[PDB]
UniProtKB/Swiss-Prot annotation:
Family: Belongs to the TRAFAC class myosin-kinesin ATPase superfamily. Kinesin family.
PTM note: The C-terminal inhibitory domain is phosphorylated. Phosphorylation relieves autoinhibition of the kinetochore motor.
Gene label: CENPE
Entry's disease: Microcephaly 13, primary, autosomal recessive: A form of microcephaly, a disease defined as a head circumference more than 3 standard deviations below the age-related mean. Brain weight is markedly reduced and the cerebral cortex is disproportionately small.
Record-listed ATP binding positions: 83-90
Subunit structure: Monomer. Interacts with CENPF. Interacts with BUB1B. Interacts with SEPT7. Interacts with KIF18A. Interacts with PRC1. Interacts with NUF2; this interaction determines kinetochore localization. Interacts with SKAP; this interaction greatly favors SKAP binding to microtubules. Interacts with TRAPPC12. Interacts with CTCF.
Function of the molecule: Microtubule plus-end-directed kinetochore motor which plays an important role in chromosome congression, microtubule-kinetochore conjugation and spindle assembly checkpoint activation. Drives chromosome congression (alignment of chromosomes at the spindle equator resulting in the formation of the metaphase plate) by mediating the lateral sliding of polar chromosomes along spindle microtubules towards the spindle equator and by aiding the establishment and maintenance of connections between kinetochores and spindle microtubules.
Protein name as it appears in the record: Centromere-associated protein E
The record's note on its domains: The protein is composed of a N-terminal kinesin-motor domain involved in the chromosome movements, a long coil-coiled region involved in the homodimerization and an inhibitory C-tail involved in autoinhibition of the N-terminal catalytic part.
Domain of life: Eukaryota
Domain Kinesin motor: 3-312
Localization per record: Chromosome, Centromere, Kinetochore; Cytoplasm, Cytoskeleton, Spindle; Chromosome, Centromere
Native source organism of the sequence: Homo sapiens (Human)
Length: 322
């Protein structure tokens, strides 16, 4: 099966002598596929832990590529980047020209792999949205900022954002051109109140469709870069909670504990309503939890959340429509 898999990626150290003069502290270490704390008794087991030396390419090839292949076969696939601000989420998901992230790699990979299937026909379209302060803005637009999450897909009642721009692309060059714009149009935002980046979620989605030479395979591939988890989580004001991150973890815990039907509060947040099907539904989900050794509380929180997600159960299948 392996419908749900979790891994951890550790941000490399720019040192071992540095900041707090002659040193800050390293609270975590990873050996084989376990991550334990320096001087403490907490340890965590994951079926894969990438160390500071391993490259985004390797993370992509081991984790993401199988999801892409599955997407091409008609399976819904979702991938999240979760972790503290500055732990490597965007580096892993978007990256640079020197070190392409998972999103651009997936695009290049998809266009190269559909060619290995001449008998069938391919239809691809992309979307790019941002979720901030409960409000959903379209990143390939002209100005209706806030859209609603409707349900009218009476074919299992699938969720969707009230007609958000969906652009048809034939080349990876065009796909990436939309990303670039979306990235840019992220700052005609910024000074509504900034570093809004570390406080918002972004979802890049690609809908794939295919047929031979009567039934059409249809799959949704969501690629998620979440908000900083330092604001994820009994308490008074001693931090600053992000509603979505909190509801995300709350929904994950319940699923891992055995709850279903309606004991799962997907509706208490936009994030969890939108990505509802990815949390215990009809998709292959993977979570990449980025961590930084020099952090203790934040790393601990993310590890607990990553650990809990290992036990989530999804039931994926091919989606062919008559
Ligand atoms: N695995 C890595 N290898 C080299 N540099 C990294 C790695 N992960 C993160 N960085 C660098 O660390 C800094 C933190 O980046 P970032 O991805 O923006 O954090 P986050 O998106 O989670 O808030 C960036 O300058 C980034 O290029
Ligand atoms: O700031 S964050 O966007 O991260 C999360 C806050 N936001 C509050 C409003 N709800 C949805 C209500 S409903 O639309 O389902 O009625 C989603 C989450
Ligand atoms: Mg970021």
């Amino acid at each position: 099966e392996g419908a749900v898999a979790v891994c951890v990626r550790v941000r490399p150290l720019n040192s071992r002598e540095e900041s707090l003069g002659e040193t800050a502290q390293v609270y975590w270490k990873t050996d084989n596929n376990v991550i334990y704390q320096v001087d403490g008794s907490k340890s965590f087991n994951f079926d894969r832990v990438f160390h500071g030396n391993e490259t985004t390419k390797n993370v992509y090839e081991e984790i993401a590529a199988p999801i892409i292949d599955s997407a091409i076969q008609g399976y819904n696939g979702t991938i999240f980047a979760y972790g503290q601000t500055a732990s490597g989420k965007t580096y892993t998901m978007m990256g640079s020209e020197d070190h392409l992230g998972v999103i651009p790699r997936a695009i290049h990979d998809i266009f190269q792999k559909i060619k290995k299937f001449p008998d069938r026909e391919f239809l691809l379209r992309v979307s790019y949205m941002e979720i901030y302060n409960e409000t959903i803005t379209d990143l390939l637009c002209g100005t209706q900022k806030m859209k609603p999450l409707i349900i009218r897909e009476d074919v299992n009642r699938n969720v969707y954002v009230a007609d958000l721009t969906e652009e048809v692309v034939y080349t990876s060059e065009m796909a990436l051109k939309w990303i670039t714009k979306g990235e840019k149009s992220r700052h005609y935002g910024e000074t509504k109140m900034n570093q809004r980046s570390s406080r918002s979620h972004t979802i890049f989605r690609m809908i794939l469709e295919s047929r031979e030479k009567g039934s059409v395979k249809v799959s949704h591939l969501n690629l998620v870069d979440l908000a900083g988890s330092e604001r994820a989580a009994r308490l008074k004001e001693g931090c600053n909670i992000n509603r979505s991150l909190f509801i995300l973890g709350q929904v994950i815990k319940k699923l891992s504990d055995g709850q279903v039907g309606g004991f799962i509060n997907y509706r208490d947040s936009k994030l969890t309503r939108i990505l509802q099907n990815s949390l215990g539904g009809n998709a292959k989900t993977r979570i990449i939890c980025t961590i930084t050794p020099v952090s203790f509380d934040e790393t601990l929180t993310a590890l607990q959340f990553a650990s809990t997600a290992k036990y989530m159960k999804n039931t994926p299948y091919v989606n062919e429509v008559s």
